[PDB]
Design a protein around this nucleic acid. Structure first.
Lengths: 88, 51, 271, 55, 117, 100
RNA sequence: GCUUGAGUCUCGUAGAGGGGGGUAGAAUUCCAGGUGUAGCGGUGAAAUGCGUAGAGAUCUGGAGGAAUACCGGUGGCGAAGGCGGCCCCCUGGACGAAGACUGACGCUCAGGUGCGAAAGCGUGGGGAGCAAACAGGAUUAGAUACCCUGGUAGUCCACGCCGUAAACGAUGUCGACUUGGAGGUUGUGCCCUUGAGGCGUGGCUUCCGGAGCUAACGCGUUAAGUCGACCGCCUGGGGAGUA
RNA sequence: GUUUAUUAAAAACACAGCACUGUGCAAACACGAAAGUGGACGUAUACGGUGUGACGCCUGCCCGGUGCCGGAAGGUUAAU
């Protein structure tokens, strides 16, 4: 998947601290990082239909977590999707 | 594949080819590409190898 | 990029264009242009010698460097241009000493691309070099037939020649015809294949398009009277004859090569 | 097994005509039969071992 | 004539016919004999007997060379081949090597369909 | 910067140009601040099968840690160079230093 | 709120998972050349076919395409279709060990969307082998077949379409519980490791069987047993999966 | 679109498109006692000839006759 240094950087940016690596913002940001990186991979190749299935699992799982965090705390939702530049 | 021998020799006695090539390997490559009959021939060969 | 035109107005229904966004939209390089007057198919006696020629658009000739003599001096491709006299496109190139020349554009060649003629040139597409230095089994265009003369084989678009042998002072070449020909191995040739292959995919669409490339109509022989063509006459459609040229020589089969001087150099005729 | 440059070891695990021997014969747990075969093939590319005995 | 004194007996046993070609170590043929060219056309040209008389007849017709040593190279399967080399050391040859050189593809070309007989 | 094991045969008739090449190749590794762990010159070794016929050839084992770009241009250097026949560059299998 | 469901992070493991690029060795065909000579090929037998214009056999050199022997295994990976030389690059998932974190974020899913063997279709390449169609030879009462000799589309590549199969464990998905035995494969922990051991603990998988179920056959902790959630489908044969 | 200027404007000619065939460049081919010129300052994705005539679905069998292409063994065969 993603680099150890990259995952550590995103956990450090979005968590309450390091070791808070399962929070909803953190998981969303890690999924987001990998989705964008693989936008770069699937612009090329384009017939890697197996890897894409892994990608659509990432998209769907991000969506589930955004729905959770939307119906738990909406302020965290707006700050989160504001910071990640998603939602369009 | 080769054999040789020094002057104590009488008979061919080359059963190196009942080991590898003759019996099976060339008679196998005389006939059709399937993918299908080998999966079942190997299925019933490994299903016959039982006590 | 080939493009089917949308069928507004018949005439456009069947046209396929070959558009090229990398060609230079603008005037060509002037001191490599000259006047090219149109003939009409007519010799110094005034007579029509080749039929079906005449009209079409005014064209200016572009001195294309077929010889490729500037050896060892590199040249960057300045741009690509439309040449009306050919099927292929021409690249305008700029040598390091400030001399521009037009060359036939090979297949991969874009603007800002190093080409280099001469013996010690690198083998990469665009470099003209003698065929005793090119490897066997390489696609090669703009081939010379006599050393020093200029390229005459594989010049038309999408066309290459494969070098198949180097037996001695000669290289056996598979011409685009299918013919195997021996050429002297000191003859220069340019690497790669010449580059507008999609030229053959255009379809012209109407009659006036042929007219504007200078191709007058072709009256077929059987539509004439017997005084005109050997096919001629007959009370509705009537052929009944073995098919011939308008001068009586058999079309549909009959071989018309007689050289005997260049038969030494032909290893195998085409098929 | 893990290594392909040791062609003494690899040459034990190959027949007289260049063919890989089955693990049904030589023991060799399947993980090491897979490493083995893949190492034999890397060695045959380098011409350390032969593909056959009729080159 | 030319007095080669060592050769190779390429025997090409197939299912329908065995064809024995005695050559030199350079690979230039010195004389051949087929099972089908020794009488017994048809169901009888693929037998060990036909192969051995083919090999007897190929041992003749290389007397002009004085061959004493030869390698044996065997192709194909067949009712021949085994009997064939026997006939060679029944003809005074010192049989040195017996290699089997049957062409085996490393999964190459697709073999033909056949035979719903 | 990951690990690689490079071997390559050299034409026997250019064996005297072997250590020079080695230096240049090693120099290219040090162009990218990558380090070279082992390096072996295995001598003119007999080939198990002929290639352009050409029997006995000269082998060089390398085992370099480097970024992948200089390894890639090292591969193209092995492509164009007529001296070298059969290169093989492989996996990480993190840095080794021993003999065989 | 909480952690026993679900998920994240750390470290490894195995793998024909996918996509792109390169390369290697055997073999088939073709081309050029050397030797050599009367057959070769084929079949139940033959003939068509190839062959004294020199075939077949054999050796040398070259070209090209496709597939990747041995390993290879009721072995592995994948949701399914499927994926088999070797190497690099990009990439998906699974599983295991200890610990940390989120805290029910879960399950199923009509419409919808995606992927989907083979044959087929479109455009452009390629084309060695094999081979629908086709042609010839036989067989036969006939032979639009089986067999033989040739052989085009196709099979191969790029991009798009199609959208199906005995697409099958003829067994929807997810979860829980319920006697056993022998294996395979991949992790991990402990003990003199006193070796190719002994004791456990997971993941996937094969064969046989107990209760139970089943019309029977069989299934049998990977259920067709005992339950729960949601979906899909069935309602006599034909007509007809047709108009 | 073109055509019988001055009884025929048409289904005829042309056409884009298709196919066959020739042509390796001093190209085939044409005008020319020849030189030369057109083909073309082009080069087989090009050029000439012939037929058919957008597009769609297609284009079946016959090589005995006439032609063309290929073969060289034998028969016949000019000048010398």
């Amino acid at each position: 998947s993603l680099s150890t240094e990259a995952t550590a950087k995103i956990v450090s940016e979005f968590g309450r601290d390091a070791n808070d690596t399962g929070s909803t913002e953190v998981q969303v940001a890690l999924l987001t990082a990998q989705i964008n990186h693989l936008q770069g991979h699937f612009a090329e190749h384009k017939k890697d239909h197996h890897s894409r299935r892994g990608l659509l699992r990432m998209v769907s799982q991000r969506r589930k977590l955004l729905d959770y965090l939307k119906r738990k705390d909406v302020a965290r939702y707006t700050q989160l999707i504001e910071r990640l530049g998603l939602r369009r | 594949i080769k054999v040789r021998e020094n002057e104590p020799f009488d008979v061919a006695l080359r059963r190196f080819k009942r080991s590898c090539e003759k019996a099976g390997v060339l008679a196998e490559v005389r006939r059709r590409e399937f993918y299908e009959k080998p999966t079942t021939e190997r299925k019933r060969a490994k299903a016959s190898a039982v006590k | 990029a080939v493009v089917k035109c949308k069928p507004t107005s018949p005439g456009r229904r069947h046209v396929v264009k070959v558009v090229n966004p990398e060609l230079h939209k603008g005037k060509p390089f002037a001191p490599l242009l000259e006047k090219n007057s149109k003939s009409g198919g007519r010799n110094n006696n005034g007579r029509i010698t080749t039929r079906h020629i005449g009209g079409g658009h005014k064209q200016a000739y572009r001195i294309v460097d077929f010889k490729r003599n500037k050896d060892g001096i590199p040249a960057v491709v300045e741009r690509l241009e439309y040449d009306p006299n050919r099927s292929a496109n021409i690249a305008l190139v700029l040598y390091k000493d400030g001399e521009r020349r037009y060359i036939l554009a090979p297949k991969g060649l874009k603007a800002g691309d190093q080409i280099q003629s001469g013996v010690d040139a690198a083998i990469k597409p665009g470099n003209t070099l003698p065929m005793r230095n090119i490897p066997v089994g390489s696609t090669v265009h703009n081939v010379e037939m006599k050393p020093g003369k200029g390229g005459q084989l594989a010049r038309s678009a999408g066309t290459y020649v494969q070098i198949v042998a180097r037996d001695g002072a000669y290289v056996t070449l598979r011409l685009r015809s299918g013919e195997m020909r021996k050429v002297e191995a000191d003859c220069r040739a340019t690497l790669g294949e010449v580059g507008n292959a999609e030229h053959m995919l255009r379809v012209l669409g109407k009659a006036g398009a042929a007219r504007w490339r200078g191709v007058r109509p072709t009256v077929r022989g059987t539509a004439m009277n017997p005084v005109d063509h050997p096919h001629g006459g007959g009370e509705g459609r009537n052929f009944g004859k073995h098919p011939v040229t308008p001068w009586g020589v058999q079309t549909k089969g009959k071989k018309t090569r007689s050289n005997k001087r260049t038969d030494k150099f032909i290893v195998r005729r085409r098929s | 097994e893990i290594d392909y440059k040791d062609i003494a070891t690899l040459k034990n695990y190959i027949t007289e005509s260049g063919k890989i021997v089955p693990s049904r014969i030589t023991g060799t747990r399947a993980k090491y039969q897979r490493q083995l075969a893949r190492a034999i093939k890397r060695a045959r590319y380098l011409s350390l071992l032969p593909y056959t005995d009729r080159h | 004539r030319k007095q080669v004194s060592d050769g190779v007996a390429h025997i090409h046993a197939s299912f329908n016919n065995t064809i024995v070609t005695i050559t030199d170590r350079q690979g230039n043929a010195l004389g051949w004999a087929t099972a089908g060219g020794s009488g017994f056309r048809g169901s009888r040209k693929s037998t060990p007997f036909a192969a051995q008389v083919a090999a007897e007849r190929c041992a003749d017709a290389v007397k002009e060379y004085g061959i004493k040593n030869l390698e044996v190279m065997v192709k194909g399967p067949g009712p021949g081949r085994e009997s064939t080399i026997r006939a060679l050391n029944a003809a005074g040859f010192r049989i040195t090597n017996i290699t089997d050189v049957t062409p085996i593809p490393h999964n190459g070309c697709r073999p033909p369909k056949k035979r719903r007989v | 910067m990951r690990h690689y094991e490079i071997v390559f045969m050299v034409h026997p008739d250019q064996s005297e140009q072997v250590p020079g090449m080695i230096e240049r190749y090693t120099a290219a590794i040090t162009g990218a601040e990558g380090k070279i762990h082992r390096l072996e010159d295995w001598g003119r070794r007999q080939l198990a099968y002929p290639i352009n016929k050409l029997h006995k050839a000269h082998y060089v084992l390398m085992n370099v840690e480097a970024p992948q770009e200089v390894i890639d241009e090292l591969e193209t250097t092995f492509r164009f160079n007529d001296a070298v026949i059969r290169s093989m560059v492989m996996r990480t299998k993190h840095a080794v230093t021993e003999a065989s």
